[PDB]
Design a protein around this motif. Sequence first.
Motif, PDB file in Angstrom:
ATOM      1  N   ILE A  15       0.815  -1.200   0.000  1.00 60.06           N
ATOM      2  CA  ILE A  15       0.000   0.000   0.000  1.00 60.06           C
ATOM      3  C   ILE A  15       0.848   1.248   0.000  1.00 60.06           C
ATOM      4  O   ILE A  15       2.062   1.167   0.163  1.00 60.06           O
ATOM      5  CB  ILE A  15      -0.867   0.058   1.258  1.00 60.06           C
ATOM      6  N   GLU A  16       0.180   2.398  -0.129  1.00 62.70           N
ATOM      7  CA  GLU A  16       0.826   3.698  -0.145  1.00 62.70           C
ATOM      8  C   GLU A  16       0.438   4.535   1.058  1.00 62.70           C
ATOM      9  O   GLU A  16       0.946   5.639   1.234  1.00 62.70           O
ATOM     10  CB  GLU A  16       0.477   4.453  -1.432  1.00 62.70           C
ATOM     11  N   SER A  17      -0.411   4.001   1.927  1.00 65.83           N
ATOM     12  CA  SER A  17      -0.826   4.771   3.095  1.00 65.83           C
ATOM     13  C   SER A  17      -1.199   3.984   4.354  1.00 65.83           C
ATOM     14  O   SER A  17      -1.413   2.774   4.314  1.00 65.83           O
ATOM     15  CB  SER A  17      -1.970   5.695   2.705  1.00 65.83           C
ATOM     16  N   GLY A  18      -1.306   4.715   5.462  1.00 65.14           N
ATOM     17  CA  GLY A  18      -1.638   4.133   6.753  1.00 65.14           C
ATOM     18  C   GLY A  18      -3.112   3.923   7.036  1.00 65.14           C
ATOM     19  O   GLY A  18      -3.696   3.076   6.382  1.00 65.14           O
ATOM     20  N   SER A  19      -3.723   4.698   7.952  1.00 65.80           N
ATOM     21  CA  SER A  19      -5.137   4.478   8.278  1.00 65.80           C
ATOM     22  C   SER A  19      -5.833   5.338   9.399  1.00 65.80           C
ATOM     23  O   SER A  19      -5.651   6.556   9.538  1.00 65.80           O
ATOM     24  CB  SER A  19      -5.242   2.985   8.635  1.00 65.80           C
ATOM     25  N   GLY A  20      -6.792   4.674  10.040  1.00 64.99           N
ATOM     26  CA  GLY A  20      -7.548   5.156  11.178  1.00 64.99           C
ATOM     27  C   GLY A  20      -7.565   3.832  11.957  1.00 64.99           C
ATOM     28  O   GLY A  20      -8.531   3.490  12.618  1.00 64.99           O
ATOM     29  N   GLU A  21      -6.492   3.059  11.766  1.00 65.50           N
ATOM     30  CA  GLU A  21      -6.197   1.728  12.321  1.00 65.50           C
ATOM     31  C   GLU A  21      -7.106   0.823  13.120  1.00 65.50           C
ATOM     32  O   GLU A  21      -7.258  -0.335  12.740  1.00 65.50           O
ATOM     33  CB  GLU A  21      -4.831   1.696  12.971  1.00 65.50           C
ATOM     34  N   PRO A  22      -7.631   1.267  14.282  1.00 66.22           N
ATOM     35  CA  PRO A  22      -8.488   0.297  14.959  1.00 66.22           C
ATOM     36  C   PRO A  22      -9.700  -0.028  14.107  1.00 66.22           C
ATOM     37  O   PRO A  22     -10.065  -1.189  13.961  1.00 66.22           O
ATOM     38  CB  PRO A  22      -8.887   1.035  16.246  1.00 66.22           C
ATOM     39  N   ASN A  23     -10.243   0.991  13.453  1.00 66.88           N
ATOM     40  CA  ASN A  23     -11.437   0.824  12.651  1.00 66.88           C
ATOM     41  C   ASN A  23     -11.234   0.222  11.260  1.00 66.88           C
ATOM     42  O   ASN A  23     -11.714  -0.871  10.967  1.00 66.88           O
ATOM     43  CB  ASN A  23     -12.182   2.166  12.547  1.00 66.88           C
ATOM     44  N   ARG A  24     -10.530   0.941  10.400  1.00 70.30           N
ATOM     45  CA  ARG A  24     -10.338   0.494   9.028  1.00 70.30           C
ATOM     46  C   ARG A  24      -8.952  -0.065   8.802  1.00 70.30           C
ATOM     47  O   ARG A  24      -8.059   0.674   8.431  1.00 70.30           O
ATOM     48  CB  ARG A  24     -10.574   1.669   8.054  1.00 70.30           C
ATOM     49  N   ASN A  25      -8.752  -1.359   9.009  1.00 68.14           N
ATOM     50  CA  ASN A  25      -7.418  -1.915   8.788  1.00 68.14           C
ATOM     51  C   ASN A  25      -7.109  -1.748   7.299  1.00 68.14           C
ATOM     52  O   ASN A  25      -7.965  -1.986   6.451  1.00 68.14           O
ATOM     53  CB  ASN A  25      -7.347  -3.357   9.276  1.00 68.14           C
ATOM     54  N   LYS A  26      -5.907  -1.285   6.981  1.00 68.37           N
ATOM     55  CA  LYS A  26      -5.585  -1.008   5.604  1.00 68.37           C
ATOM     56  C   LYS A  26      -5.172  -2.128   4.700  1.00 68.37           C
ATOM     57  O   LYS A  26      -5.152  -1.943   3.489  1.00 68.37           O
ATOM     58  CB  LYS A  26      -4.599   0.135   5.517  1.00 68.37           C
ATOM     59  N   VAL A  27      -4.854  -3.287   5.264  1.00 72.71           N
ATOM     60  CA  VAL A  27      -4.449  -4.449   4.467  1.00 72.71           C
ATOM     61  C   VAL A  27      -3.913  -5.577   5.346  1.00 72.71           C
ATOM     62  O   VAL A  27      -3.519  -5.340   6.471  1.00 72.71           O
ATOM     63  CB  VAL A  27      -3.380  -4.044   3.420  1.00 72.71           C
ATOM     64  N   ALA A  28      -3.925  -6.806   4.862  1.00 75.61           N
ATOM     65  CA  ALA A  28      -3.396  -7.886   5.677  1.00 75.61           C
ATOM     66  C   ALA A  28      -2.098  -8.344   5.024  1.00 75.61           C
ATOM     67  O   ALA A  28      -1.800  -7.944   3.894  1.00 75.61           O
ATOM     68  CB  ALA A  28      -4.405  -9.035   5.769  1.00 75.61           C
ATOM     69  N   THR A  29      -1.288  -9.108   5.746  1.00 72.29           N
ATOM     70  CA  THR A  29      -0.045  -9.630   5.185  1.00 72.29           C
ATOM     71  C   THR A  29       0.453 -10.749   6.095  1.00 72.29           C
ATOM     72  O   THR A  29       0.090 -10.781   7.270  1.00 72.29           O
ATOM     73  CB  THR A  29       1.017  -8.520   4.994  1.00 72.29           C
ATOM     74  N   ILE A  30       1.255 -11.672   5.563  1.00 74.64           N
ATOM     75  CA  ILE A  30       1.742 -12.812   6.359  1.00 74.64           C
ATOM     76  C   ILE A  30       2.892 -12.528   7.332  1.00 74.64           C
ATOM     77  O   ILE A  30       3.981 -12.119   6.936  1.00 74.64           O
ATOM     78  CB  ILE A  30       2.068 -14.048   5.460  1.00 74.64           C
ATOM     79  N   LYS A  31       2.696 -12.832   8.608  1.00 77.05           N
ATOM     80  CA  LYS A  31       3.674 -12.515   9.639  1.00 77.05           C
ATOM     81  C   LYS A  31       4.906 -13.402   9.516  1.00 77.05           C
ATOM     82  O   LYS A  31       5.960 -12.945   9.030  1.00 77.05           O
ATOM     83  CB  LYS A  31       3.054 -12.655  11.028  1.00 77.05           C
ATOM     84  N   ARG A  32       4.839 -14.645   9.984  1.00 79.30           N
ATOM     85  CA  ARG A  32       5.952 -15.581  10.058  1.00 79.30           C
ATOM     86  C   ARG A  32       6.731 -15.626   8.752  1.00 79.30           C
ATOM     87  O   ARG A  32       7.824 -16.232   8.688  1.00 79.30           O
ATOM     88  CB  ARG A  32       5.456 -16.984  10.401  1.00 79.30           C
ATOM     89  N   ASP A  33       6.184 -15.064   7.702  1.00 75.19           N
ATOM     90  CA  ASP A  33       6.890 -15.008   6.456  1.00 75.19           C
ATOM     91  C   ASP A  33       7.400 -13.584   6.376  1.00 75.19           C
ATOM     92  O   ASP A  33       8.592 -13.338   6.541  1.00 75.19           O
ATOM     93  CB  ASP A  33       5.961 -15.282   5.272  1.00 75.19           C
ATOM     94  N   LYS A  34       6.471 -12.640   6.252  1.00 72.85           N
ATOM     95  CA  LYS A  34       6.839 -11.246   6.099  1.00 72.85           C
ATOM     96  C   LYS A  34       7.282 -10.459   7.314  1.00 72.85           C
ATOM     97  O   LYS A  34       8.359  -9.845   7.266  1.00 72.85           O
ATOM     98  CB  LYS A  34       5.791 -10.478   5.299  1.00 72.85           C
ATOM     99  N   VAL A  35       6.508 -10.455   8.399  1.00 70.56           N
ATOM    100  CA  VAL A  35       6.967  -9.691   9.558  1.00 70.56           C
ATOM    101  C   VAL A  35       8.351 -10.165   9.972  1.00 70.56           C
ATOM    102  O   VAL A  35       9.221  -9.347  10.279  1.00 70.56           O
ATOM    103  CB  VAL A  35       6.014  -9.709  10.769  1.00 70.56           C
ATOM    104  N   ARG A  36       8.596 -11.469   9.895  1.00 72.21           N
ATOM    105  CA  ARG A  36       9.924 -11.955  10.251  1.00 72.21           C
ATOM    106  C   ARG A  36      10.985 -11.363   9.305  1.00 72.21           C
ATOM    107  O   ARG A  36      11.985 -10.814   9.765  1.00 72.21           O
ATOM    108  CB  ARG A  36       9.992 -13.481  10.239  1.00 72.21           C
ATOM    109  N   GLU A  37      10.742 -11.417   7.995  1.00 70.63           N
ATOM    110  CA  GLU A  37      11.699 -10.880   7.031  1.00 70.63           C
ATOM    111  C   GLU A  37      12.094  -9.459   7.388  1.00 70.63           C
ATOM    112  O   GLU A  37      13.282  -9.145   7.499  1.00 70.63           O
ATOM    113  CB  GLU A  37      11.140 -10.893   5.608  1.00 70.63           C
ATOM    114  N   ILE A  38      11.096  -8.605   7.607  1.00 67.37           N
ATOM    115  CA  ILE A  38      11.365  -7.205   7.935  1.00 67.37           C
ATOM    116  C   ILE A  38      12.184  -7.124   9.203  1.00 67.37           C
ATOM    117  O   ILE A  38      13.155  -6.371   9.262  1.00 67.37           O
ATOM    118  CB  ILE A  38      10.066  -6.394   8.094  1.00 67.37           C
ATOM    119  N   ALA A  39      11.820  -7.955  10.182  1.00 74.32           N
ATOM    120  CA  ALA A  39      12.517  -7.999  11.466  1.00 74.32           C
ATOM    121  C   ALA A  39      13.971  -8.295  11.221  1.00 74.32           C
ATOM    122  O   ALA A  39      14.836  -7.768  11.910  1.00 74.32           O
ATOM    123  CB  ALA A  39      11.936  -9.060  12.373  1.00 74.32           C
ATOM    124  N   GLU A  40      14.238  -9.127  10.222  1.00 77.56           N
ATOM    125  CA  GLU A  40      15.607  -9.492   9.894  1.00 77.56           C
ATOM    126  C   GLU A  40      16.372  -8.304   9.345  1.00 77.56           C
ATOM    127  O   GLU A  40      17.384  -7.909   9.900  1.00 77.56           O
ATOM    128  CB  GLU A  40      15.629 -10.663   8.911  1.00 77.56           C
TER     129      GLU A  40
END
Length: 67
Positions: A15-40
């Motif tokens: 995506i190109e933007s954030g949100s109003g987070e609790p209400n309108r989540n802006k997109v989903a993505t895979i953690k153990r695959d992606k969040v881990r990669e970024i963490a790396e």
Amino acid sequence: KTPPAAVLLKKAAGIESGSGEPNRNKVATIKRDKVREIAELKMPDLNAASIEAAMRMIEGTARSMGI
RNA sequence: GCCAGGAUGUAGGCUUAGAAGCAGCCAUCAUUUAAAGAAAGCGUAAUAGCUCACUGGU
Ligand SMILES: [Mg+2]
Ligand SMILES: [Mg+2]
Ligand SMILES: [Os+3]
Ligand SMILES: [Os+3]
């Protein structure tokens, strides 16, 4: 520093933007695959012990923007 | 009381000419911690600087 968690997550999330987070989540993505990669990649800049911690932080920035 | 910490992602997101803890709108997680708010004031154009909360010492 390296690309902030925010932009990393943006590019990851697909995506190109954030949100109003609790209400309108802006997109989903895979953690153990992606969040881990970024963490790396972001590790040189994280004061984390384990990758699992490195993650908790990244996942934590994803919440602030709603992902 | 006085001395020293008050930190990392990170200038959170969004929005806004700027919007960086501190115009306003959403939230308010997680890290490393003895402790340390997505900050309670002052301050800045925005930054910075200063205090406060919490912690150590005495
Ligand atoms: Mg400060
Ligand atoms: Mg901080
Ligand atoms: Os000081
Ligand atoms: Os804490």
